[PDB]
Amino acid sequence: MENFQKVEKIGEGTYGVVYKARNKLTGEVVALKKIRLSTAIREISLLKELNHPNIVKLLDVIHTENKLYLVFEFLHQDLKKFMDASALTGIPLPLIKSYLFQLLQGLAFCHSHRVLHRDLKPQNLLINTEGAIKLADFGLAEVVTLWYRAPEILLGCKYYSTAVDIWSLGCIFAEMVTRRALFPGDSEIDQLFRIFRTLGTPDEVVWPGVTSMPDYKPSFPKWARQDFSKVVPPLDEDGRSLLSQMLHYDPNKRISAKAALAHPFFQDVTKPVPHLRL
């Protein structure tokens, strides 16, 4: 760690503290995560090889004393701050579309490598001046945000799949479009019920096996489903159709990242550059 000079703290929570730092030798500016303390070290060192333009690079893993440091490629801004900055006008559709497309590319890559993110949220999606967007904080190692949690996770499924990331991304897509969180729950049951209130209480018809999930209770209220026209106005039918497929209750029916990339919504995708104030 002596090889790094901390510039300023930029994060704190899930694991440890995050600092913007300079590599005293390479001259590089990086994001340095210091986690307070065998399989882990091995697995993590592995994922280090995983390289894709839409995944934040893990540059170094440094273990010393009862401390573990992860060194990442540095990006100045995240999507949550950009969404907040764009709140008055909203992010232009062509940029929402580019970001969604890129995130699906990153996920398709992770997923083809049997890697699940598990906790996608705007705070952990980093953007740059070139119009790129990247997946960060995979939880490789505060109030927990539940807004983007897939229903199978909330219902106690222990062996959930890559479909959980597609659900999270659908929630983020909707939020970019409407400028409002889709399902802002403040507890696990409130998150669950907010989902049910919008998409309808799931049953065996639309989600075979749902009534047998660990945390499923027959006593859940039975709400009827709303229509997406009310959910994400004024997103076009191509966008709504794709969102509906990313928000299917049944994980096995939920669209994959690879198939989503082929959806008609992306026929006219481009790569616009955002206006960022760093």
Ligand SMILES: COC(=O)[C@H](Cc1ccc(O)cc1)NC(=O)c1cc(C(=O)O)c2cc(-c3cccc(Cl)c3)ccc2n1
């Ligand atoms: C907004 O704040 C953040 O996003 C913070 C700080 C930050 C802030 C700015 C930055 O530029 C970087 C980090 N991010 C993190 O703490 C953080 C944590 C992990 C992790 O799982 O431990 C992680 C893993 C990969 C990775 C890489 C390759 C393969 C795989 Cl499976 C995973 C890539 C980025 C990651 N970032």
